[PDB]
Structure 1
Amino acid sequence: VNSFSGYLKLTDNVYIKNADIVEEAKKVKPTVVVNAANVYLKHGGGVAGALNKATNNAMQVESDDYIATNGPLKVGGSCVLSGHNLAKHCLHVVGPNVNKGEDIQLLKSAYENFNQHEVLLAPLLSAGIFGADPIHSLRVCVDTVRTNVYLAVFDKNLYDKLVSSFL
């Protein structure tokens, strides 16, 4: 049993809810919240900007030190950093950004990072300002992630379309 409430069950391991991930993280304090990161961990907008704002910029400060030491992530890659006030850990995952012309086949690689964690609160990778089709992102998630994932969907309209169209 876990703390997650109000989710629709899509599969054995994937759950979905129309919820503000910042507000969901603040309520649940999950072991892992996933950030929709870029390779520079520049948390300017979307999931990244909202999560970072909720940490009072502490996520960005920590991220800048990580990049100064390690250099950029790979598209499809990830790193584990602090969850600050939102979670124990933040898994920063880089999905491909279609608005930069990145290979959508890298979305499966991105979701494979989730399998290193037994339970996660996450957004749909490569959705929103990353430009991918969220219906596609949900299909890749279901077909790739084997651990227990609780997906928070920012738009109510999109949430209802993801549920209604789910095979």
Structure 2
Amino acid sequence: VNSFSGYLKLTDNVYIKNADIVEEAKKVKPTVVVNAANVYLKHGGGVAGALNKATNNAMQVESDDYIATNGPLKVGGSCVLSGHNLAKHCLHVVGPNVNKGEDIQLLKSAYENFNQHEVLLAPLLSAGIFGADPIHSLRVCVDTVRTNVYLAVFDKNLYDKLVSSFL
């Protein structure tokens, strides 16, 4: 039993809700919140910009130190950093950005990072400003993640389409 509330159950391990991931994280304080990161951990917009804003830019400060030490992530890769005031940890995961021409096949590799964590609060990878089809992202999520994932979908119209079209 966990403290996630109001989710629709899609499969044995995947749950979904129309919610602002920032507000969800502040309420639940999950062990892991997933950020929709880029390889530079530049959290300018989308989910990343919103999460970073909620940390008062502390996420960005920590991220800049990480990159200065380690260099960029790989598309499809991840790193674990602090969750600041939002969660114990933030798993920064880089899905392919279609508006940069990146290979959508890397979306499965991106979701594989979730399997290293028993429970996660997460957005749909490569959705929103990353330009992929969110219906496809949900399919890859369900077919790749085996741990317990609670998906927050900001857009109510998109949430209803994802539920109604889910096979």
Deviation string, structure 1 residues 56-105 (Cα, Å, up to 9, x no partner): 00000000000000000000000000000000000000000000000000
Match of 1:50 in 2: 50
Q: Does 1:126 align with 2:126?
A: yes
Q: How does 1:80-91 map to 2 (within 5 A)?
A: 80-91=80-91
Q: CA deviation at 1:115?
A: 0.1
Match of 1:79 in 2: 79
| Equivalent position SS for 1:159 | helix
Q: CA deviation at 1:106?
A: 0.0
| Equivalent position SS for 1:17 | strand
Q: Which runs of 5+ in 1 are unaligned?
A: none
Match of 2:23 in 1: 23
Q: CA deviation at 1:38?
A: 0.0
Q: CA deviation at 1:121?
A: 0.0
Q: CA deviation at 1:122?
A: 0.0
Q: Which runs of 4+ in 1 moved over 4 A?
A: none
Task: Report the RMSD for the aligned CA atoms in angstroms.
Answer: 0.1
Within 2, Cα distance between the matches of 1:71 and 1:18? 35
Q: CA deviation at 1:52?
A: 0.0
Within 2, Cα distance between the matches of 1:163 and 1:22? 21
Deviation string, structure 1 residues 16-66 (Cα, Å, up to 9, x no partner): 000000000000000000000000000000000000000000000000000
Match of 1:103 in 2: 103
Within 2, Cα distance between the matches of 1:108 and 1:146? 12
With normalisation by structure 2, the TM-score equals 1.00
Aligned residues between the structures: 167
